[PDB]
Ligand binder design. Structure first.
Ligand SMILES: O=S(=O)(O)C(F)(F)C(F)(F)C(F)(F)C(F)(F)C(F)(F)C(F)(F)C(F)(F)C(F)(F)F
Ligand SMILES: O=S(=O)(O)C(F)(F)C(F)(F)C(F)(F)C(F)(F)C(F)(F)C(F)(F)C(F)(F)C(F)(F)F
Length: 554
């Protein structure tokens, strides 16, 4: 009995939560209360299974049960139904932006019913983030609960809560985006791509770890994510705990940076492990040359065990390169692979695969130079203007892309600047390029829902590893027809005056996207000249005797 097994392994609380999450991700549009009803029925049922694993319906898969419950798609049978539920996950669901009500209202609701409030949190995130790393969402719910527990008792409920909630929202969106890439990686590119990812990350993270260890953690982590991305949240959370549990029983085989996370309560622990600092690279590790370029058996060993050897390479290269983005290490490993694929078949492989690392230069240089160039641009512009720059860039690159998406991605793109450009070069590239993988992936998923740009589609369906160079390589499509100057898109409301800094940025940014859409191939100064026109008009209308009409007159 799986639902019992999981209920047992997860405990009711996390079971409930994961089931809610699973429901809210399966039925994003469905009301909270219909989800909790389903969850309770499932939980109630799970309990009957914990008690007798032979009770009538307890041997059914989690898929059948959730899907059966969900069905209270639905016309379909398993496993086509679960596939159906998964494919209907909506990365951009038509759901009201979660509008934070005032703290006292929230704090009242939180105290009115903590679980319901906490379940409401899960539900609202999960349904908005249908790929949200479900166990991680439990961690968020815990922190959300902790926020509300403490901050609701605070003198300044808002001043306590808001920053914390802002942190969790941000962390949430980051985690969602992040997990979204795992699911996209897994689902669009397959297990191997994810495995490659994981070998690269974990090798970087756990360079002291033996390859077999990195592999074991990779197979387990992959299994975690496959399950999570597959809406198998229960297995996923459970396998995650198992993985956290494994890692923590095996820290000395994995990382010396694990001390603190492995002491951490279950949810914190996995979260902690998932983002532990890269471990110290083992001292005096040799170059990959003897094994991967220099050996005469390279061709043989690749061929004998391709993915292992490539994994060993990726492991060996990644563990040596926490200063490389995962995608880079992935690119290098793909390059290695493909070079070996041609060298091994070439007249003298030893000869030509000895040169394999020379192909690595451009691959390594490109992100570096990109990260360096764009981060100077960032340091010149700061996050916001860096966002405006990228927003224009991307709008010009892929103008068909919905502006909200454009804005969101560009903003996020620009956020990598803030996150990464602060870092010295040694931490910039993994930070930047991997966050870039996350953000582009956003662009990718957001756009996929309503594809309107063949370039985005192209760049997103192509090698995940190469997704970023692909967008980077994109230049202005002139095959894009500017949109006529709709007033409504450039006639902001007086609500702009009341907008938070961020929201007024999103708005200028939105205008900036639209303006670029209205008139692409306009240069930065001309774009600046209407952006400044807009902001002035806004400044004017915002301080006008009557705002709403001042605004109307544009
Ligand atoms: O070079 S690639 O990244 O394209 C790659 F071939 F997929 C590879 F990453 F090297 C890889 F070998 F496939 C791998 F990603 F490492 C791997 F598939 F994960 C793997 F290492 F082979 C593995 F599947 F995990 C295995 F090692 F077999 F356990
Ligand atoms: O080259 S692109 O503009 O297409 C890009 F992929 F978005 C990008 F170059 F990575 C970029 F987003 F523009 C970018 F500026 F490089 C970046 F992604 F934001 C970035 F390079 F990561 C950055 F933000 F500049 C970074 F410097 F990495 F922080």
């Amino acid at each position: 009995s799986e639902v019992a097994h999981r209920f047992k392994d997860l405990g009711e609380e996390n079971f409930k939560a994961l089931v809610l999450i699973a429901f809210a991700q399966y039925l994003q549009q469905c009301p909270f209360e219909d989800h909790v009803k389903l969850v309770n029925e499932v939980t109630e049922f799970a309990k009957t299974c914990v008690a007798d694993e032979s009770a009538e319906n307890c041997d059914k898969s989690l898929h059948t049960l959730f899907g059966d419950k969900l069905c209270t798609c639905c016309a379909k049978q398993e496993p086509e139904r679960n596939e159906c539920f998964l494919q209907h996950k909506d990365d951009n669901p038509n759901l009201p932006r979660l509008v934070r009500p005032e703290v006292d209202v929230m704090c009242t609701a939180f105290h009115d019913n903590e679980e319901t409030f906490l379940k409401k949190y899960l539900y609202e995130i999960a349904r908005r983030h249908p790929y949200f790393y479900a166990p991680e969402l439990l961690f968020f719910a815990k922190r959300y609960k902790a926020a509300f527990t403490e901050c609701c008792q605070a003198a300044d409920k808002a001043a306590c809560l808001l920053p914390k909630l802002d942190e969790l929202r941000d962390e949430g969106k980051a985690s969602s985006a992040k997990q979204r890439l795992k699911c996209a990686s897994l689902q669009k590119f397959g297990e191997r791509a994810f495995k490659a990812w994981a070998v690269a990350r974990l090798s970087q993270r756990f360079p002291k770890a033996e390859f077999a260890e990195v592999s074991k953690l990779v197979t387990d982590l992959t299994k975690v994510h496959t399950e999570c991305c597959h809406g198998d949240l229960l297995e996923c959370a459970d396998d995650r705990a198992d993985l956290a549990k494994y890692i923590c029983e095996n820290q000395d085989s994995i990382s010396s940076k694990l001390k603190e996370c492995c002491e951490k309560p279950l949810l914190e622990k996995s979260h902690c492990i998932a983002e532990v600092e890269n471990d110290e690279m083992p001292a005096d590790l040799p170059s990959l040359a003897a094994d991967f370029v220099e050996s005469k058996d390279v061709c043989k060993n690749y061929a004998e065990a391709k993915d292992v050897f490539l994994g060993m390479f990726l492991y060996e290269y990644a563990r040596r390169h926490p200063d490389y983005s995962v995608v880079l290490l992935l690119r290098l490993a793909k390059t290695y692979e493909t070079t070996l694929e041609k060298c091994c078949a070439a007249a003298d492989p030893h000869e030509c695969y000895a040169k394999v690392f020379d192909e690595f230069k451009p691959l390594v240089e490109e992100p570096q130079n990109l990260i360096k160039q764009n981060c100077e641009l960032f340091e010149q512009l700061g996050e916001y203007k860096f966002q405006n720059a990228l927003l224009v860039r991307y709008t010009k690159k892929v103008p068909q892309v919905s502006t909200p998406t454009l804005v969101e991605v560009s903003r996020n793109l620009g956020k990598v600047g803030s996150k990464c450009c602060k870092h010295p070069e040694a931490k910039r590239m993994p930070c930047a390029e991997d966050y870039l993988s996350v953000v582009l992936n956003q662009l990718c998923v957001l756009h996929e829902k309503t594809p309107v740009s063949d370039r985005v589609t192209k760049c997103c369906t192509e090698s995940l590893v190469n997704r970023r160079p692909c967008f980077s390589a994109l230049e202005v499509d002139e095959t894009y027809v500017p949109k006529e100057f709709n007033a409504e898109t450039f006639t902001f409301h007086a609500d702009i005056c009341t907008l938070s800094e961020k929201e007024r940025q999103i708005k200028k940014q939105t205008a900036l996207v639209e303006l670029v859409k209205h008139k692409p191939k306009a240069t930065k100064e001309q774009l600046k000249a209407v952006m400044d026109d807009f902001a002035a008009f806004v400044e004017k209308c915002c301080k006008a005797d009557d705002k709403e009409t001042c605004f109307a007159e544009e």
